[PDB]
């Protein structure tokens, strides 16, 4: 839960999962970028955010 993560300030678990490539789901109202470029999909930019 991104709200709980923001409030606590403890990023130990999220950092450990991002570093170790552990599948997760970040839940919370989020703004998103709508990318229509196929080359962006090939470049895998969605994983760089």
């Amino acid at each position: 839960n991104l709200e709980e993560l923001m409030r606590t300030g403890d990023y130990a678990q999220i950092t450990n999962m991002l570093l170790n490539n552990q599948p997760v789901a970040l839940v919370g109202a989020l703004p998103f970028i709508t990318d229509s470029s196929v080359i962006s999909l090939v470049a895998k930019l969605d994983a760089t955010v």
């Binding site: 606590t8 130990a12 678990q13 450990n16 552990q22 599948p23």
Partner: protein, 396 residues
């Protein structure tokens, strides 16, 4: 093993210390250790079972960290923590059961289950913390080749054996001389009998001797010596040596004479006790030598003299007993005893799931056969399963 023990102790401390209303300062370090364990275990897949009737169970860890409270814990905190604690306790119990039902002739001290082999990887060493139990302490010492020690109350060190030896006999079994003994658990009950009451024995003394070889060295042992062996103090009918016939025993108990208990280590006398009954200390020994004597009383009242004629028949047979009880001792190897439940737990787990007999332990985990042939391989496997059993007993 250290990682499994650390998981189990972390979960036990979580159950005991994460209670409603408790100060967060009382569990700060415990919560830190628990969160470290959650981090280390998250994202890992474990599999348990697949032997006997033990079901195949898959364990996935996707738990969030335990939170913090300013002053005291509340009910919400306790329930949230308890869900995770329950899942982890189930996982640990299943892993311990999986490890208890396995054995290996080669490298029996090493983990046998896939889950415990995975837990022995470097990534899980983070979970390792305080190793204060007796069994885990001895496990760590044995890993380092340091001197180990297990304290037993009434150690199960003597395999059951109710036997006898006839030093003098004949097919009619009417003038017999010998010794009959029961070595059961922590108890020795020996009795030397002479049907003639040492009438023709030189100096009217008949010498009886019983040597018991312990399969492991016992140190710092408290032993109770009592003059009489109540087990062999009443009349009975005893099979022959080959079972071809039965003979009759009709004890009349006399005080054992010149009693000598020798506790020996590697053929060297370590302790000697002469005519000493009650509590004695055998500091370090692997052999017990009880040498006693039947002495014909030089003076007898008419009733006593009527029982011991100059010649046959001998209707009343003189007997001198001896009872030895190891109340407590210390052994470098794991043994069953009256106070602990490790053997019982391992046997129960093996029986419940119908574990087929392996290549190490005797069928049914029978203790007499196990201690009779207590090989170093058996010692390693039994120590492993006993340590896992204690780890499981922490939780279950």
């Amino acid at each position: 093993m250290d990682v499994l023990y650390s998981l189990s102790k972390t979960l036990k401390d979580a159950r005991d210390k994460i209670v409603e209303g408790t100060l967060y300062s009382n569990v700060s370090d415990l919560i830190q250790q628990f969160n470290q364990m959650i981090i280390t275990m998250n994202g890992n897949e474990f599999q348990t079972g697949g032997i006997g009737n033990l079901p195949i169970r898959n364990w996935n860890f996707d738990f969030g960290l335990l939170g913090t409270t300013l002053l005291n814990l509340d009910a919400n905190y306790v329930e949230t923590a308890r869900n995770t604690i329950d899942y982890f306790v189930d996982f640990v119990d299943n892993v311990c059961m999986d490890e208890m039902v396995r054995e290996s002739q080669r490298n029996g001290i090493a983990p046998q289950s896939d889950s415990l082999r995975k837990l022995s990887g470097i990534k899980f060493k983070r979970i390792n913390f305080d190793n204060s139990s007796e069994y885990i302490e001895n496990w760590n010492l044995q890993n380092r080749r340091q001197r180990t020690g297990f304290t037993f109350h009434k150690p199960n060190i003597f395999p059951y054996s109710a036997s006898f030896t006839l030093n003098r006999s004949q097919p009619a079994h009417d003038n017999l001389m010998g010794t009959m003994w029961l070595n059961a658990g922590s108890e020795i009950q020996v009795a030397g009998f002479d049907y003639s009451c040492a009438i023709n024995a030189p100096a009217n003394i008949q010498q009886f001797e019983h040597i018991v070889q312990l399969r492991r060295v016992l140190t710092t042992a408290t032993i109770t010596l009592l003059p009489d062996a109540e087990r062999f103090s009443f009349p009975r009918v005893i099979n022959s040596a080959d079972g071809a016939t039965t003979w009759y025993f009709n004890p009349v108990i006399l005080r054992p004479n010149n009693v000598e208990v020798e506790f020996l280590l590697n053929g060297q006398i370590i302790n000697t006790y002469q005519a000493r009954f009650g509590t004695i200390i055998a500091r370090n020994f692997d052999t017990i030598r009880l040498s006693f004597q039947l002495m014909r009383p030089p003076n007898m009242t008419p009733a006593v003299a009527a029982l011991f004629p100059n010649a046959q028949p001998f209707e009343h047979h003189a007997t001198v007993g001896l009872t030895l009880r190891i109340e407590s001792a210390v052994c470098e190897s794991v043994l069953a005893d009256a106070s602990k439940t490790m053997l019982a737990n391992v046997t129960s787990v093996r029986q419940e799931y119908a574990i087929p007999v392996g290549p190490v332990f005797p069928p049914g985990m029978n203790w007499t056969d196990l201690i009779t042939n207590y090989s170093p391989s058996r010692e390693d496997n039994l120590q492993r399963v006993f340590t896992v059993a204690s780890i499981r007993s922490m939780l279950v």
